[PDB]
């Protein structure tokens, strides 16, 4: 059930050599400071880049996948993307679907992120958050197991930024459901508390190298976080919420 497997992945002095594995139905979070090299690793995992090291995806290696078959088993969301001109949402979304036949799916998935009323609006005419939701919905539609039996991995580069509290929570529900249906999900998060609450496994990174990896609770320990970010951290558990405070 291992979907992804990295060995000795490296890239200049911006991403030291790493080696891990990604299981089929676990939400992995990539955490680490600016300059840790999360976006780099993620892009590489997506097949968007080649370089040092080697990684295997679905029992076959990435360098041996066609850009087209790859987009059937993997969906990637770059950290920043600029909206196209005068492109209606409904069109941008349906453009990511492999099975354009399923329109009920587009209404439920776009509906979950509250894009019901906005299907007819052009994408260069949205709030920052709204567009970000549009991106997220497209990429979900591209890999939703309810319409794609080929979908496995789903990488996401900080897909929670600019989303209001409510929407953040909604996406949490969405990804939760995909992971429950057996779909690997890998993403960076700068919100430690959120990782502690929603991630299964984490990868702490710093200066390109890997510091800690494993259960989210055995990774985000105040001493580890002290090495990575350079600051004291207190753990706390109130009413059963396991938050993370900083002693600044």
């Amino acid at each position: 059930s291992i979907v992804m497997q990295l060995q000795d992945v490296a890239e200049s002095t911006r991403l030291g050599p790493l080696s891990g594995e990604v299981r089929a139905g676990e939400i992995l979070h990539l955490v680490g400071p600016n300059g840790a090299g999360k976006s780099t690793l993620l892009a590489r995992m997506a097949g968007m880049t080649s370089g040092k090291g080697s990684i295997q995806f679905a029992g076959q290696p990435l360098e041996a996948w066609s850009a087209t078959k790859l987009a059937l088993h993997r969906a990637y969301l770059s950290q920043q993307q600029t909206p196209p001109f005068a492109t209606p949402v409904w069109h941008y979304l349906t453009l990511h679907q492999h099975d354009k036949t399923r329109t009920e799916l587009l209404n439920d998935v776009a509906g979950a992120l509250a894009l019901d009323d906005k299907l007819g609006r052009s994408t260069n005419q949205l709030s920052g958050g709204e567009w970000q939701r549009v991106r997220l919905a497209a990429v979900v539609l591209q890999i939703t197991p309810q319409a794609n039996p080929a979908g496995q991995l789903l990488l996401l580069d900080q897909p929670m930024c600019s989303l209001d509290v409510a929407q953040q929570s909604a996406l949490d529900k969405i990804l939760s459901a995909l992971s429950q249906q057996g779909l690997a999900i890998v993403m960076s998060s700068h919100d430690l508390n959120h990782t502690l609450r929603h991630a299964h496994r984490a990868w702490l990174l710093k200066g390109g190298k890997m510091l800690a990896s494993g259960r989210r609770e055995e990774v985000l320990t105040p001493p580890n976080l002290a090495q990575a970010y350079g600051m004291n951290f207190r753990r706390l558990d109130i009413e059963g919420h396991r938050m993370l405070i900083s002693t600044i």
């Binding site: 997506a46 790859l70 770059s78 600029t82 941008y92 453009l95 329109t103 299907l119």
Partner: protein
């Protein structure tokens, strides 16, 4: 919800119907307009069999074909190079064909059997596009590739101008007809060219999906499963083929593959599923109208398309940006 997906579909089909109907009317127009208006009734008379069969019909067909080709090529390039001014005679291909032509006349001493010249033009076009491919395959960024391509065009200009300096058969009228376009001498003898245009036209029009994907990010497209390094090569190839045959067939024609796709977009044709066929039909009509206006506008002789095209097009063009 999801009446939108369908709503835009009804408006799409209405647009394409309008464009095609306009194109037919243009067809019958040129088939009858001329020195002597031949009403559709008298189309089987001996005058109809000489004027509306081996004269206006094969010339009109070529015009529709080239007009469609130029406009489509325009749309494709503008979206490939990510730039409003992308035209077709901008990467030198249009000029390449010319260099090939002259090379043919001079080398052949000026005794060639006409059809040999068309082939020469196609050869120039292929040479250039081939070079362009070697410049692209190197993984050059789009911006850099465009610049290099423009530069090829400038070189071909400077080359073609030198060859015209050492030629006896340099006719002033023929130079102006070749460098501003013209279908003056177009018979059924040119039928092979008209054929060479058809498949590529059909094929490139079917290809709306990947261009809708190019319309997003370089990266959004690559991740959705587009082979950029391939489609880029393909597009440059197709575009070069169409421009090449077009020039071999009618000469250097501008305006069309520049304005016709901009105009279509300003009227709200964004989706390529409608713009590619839109560009073909509109491109065909505009060119067809201009020929109907360049062959019977001056009793003296035949004007070149590069005049009437811009003469009518730009005024009307400003009239659409001015307010609309």
């Amino acid at each position: 919800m999801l009446t939108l997906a369908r709503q835009q579909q009804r408006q799409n089909i209405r647009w394409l119907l309008s464009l095609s109907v306009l194109m037919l009317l243009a067809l019958l127009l040129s088939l009858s307009a001329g020195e002597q208006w031949i009403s559709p009734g008298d189309w089987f008379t001996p005058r109809g069999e000489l004027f509306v069969w081996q004269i206006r019909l094969p010339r009109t067909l070529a015009v529709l074909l080239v007009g469609a080709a130029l406009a489509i090529s325009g749309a494709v390039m503008q979206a490939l190079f990510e730039n409003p001014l992308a035209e077709p005679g901008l990467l030198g291909v249009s000029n390449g064909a010319g260099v090939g032509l002259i090379a043919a006349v001079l080398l052949g001493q000026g005794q060639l059997p006409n059809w040999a010249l068309g082939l020469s033009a196609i050869a120039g076009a292929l040479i250039i596009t081939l070079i362009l491919l070697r410049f692209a395959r190197r993984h050059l960024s789009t911006s850099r590739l465009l610049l290099a391509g423009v530069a090829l065009g400038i070189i071909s200009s400077a080359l073609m101008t030198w060859a015209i300096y050492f030629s006896t058969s340099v006719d002033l009228r023929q130079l102006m007809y070749w460098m501003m376009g013209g279908f003056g001498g177009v018979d059924w003898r040119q039928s092979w060219l008209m054929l060479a245009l058809i498949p590529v036209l059909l094929w490139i029009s079917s290809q709306s999906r990947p261009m809708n994907m190019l319309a997003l990010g370089e990266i959004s497209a690559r991740q959705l499963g587009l082979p950029l390094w391939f489609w880029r090569n393909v597009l440059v190839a197709a575009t070069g083929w169409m421009v090449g045959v077009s020039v071999a067939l009618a000469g250097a024609i501008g305006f069309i593959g520049l304005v016709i796709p901009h105009i279509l977009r300003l009227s709200g044709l964004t989706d390529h599923r409608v713009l590619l066929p839109g560009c073909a039909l509109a491109g065909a009509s505009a060119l067809l109208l201009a020929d109907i206006v360049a062959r019977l506008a001056l009793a003296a002789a035949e004007l070149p398309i590069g005049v009437v095209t811009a003469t009518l097009g730009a005024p009307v063009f400003i009239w659409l940006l001015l307010k609309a």
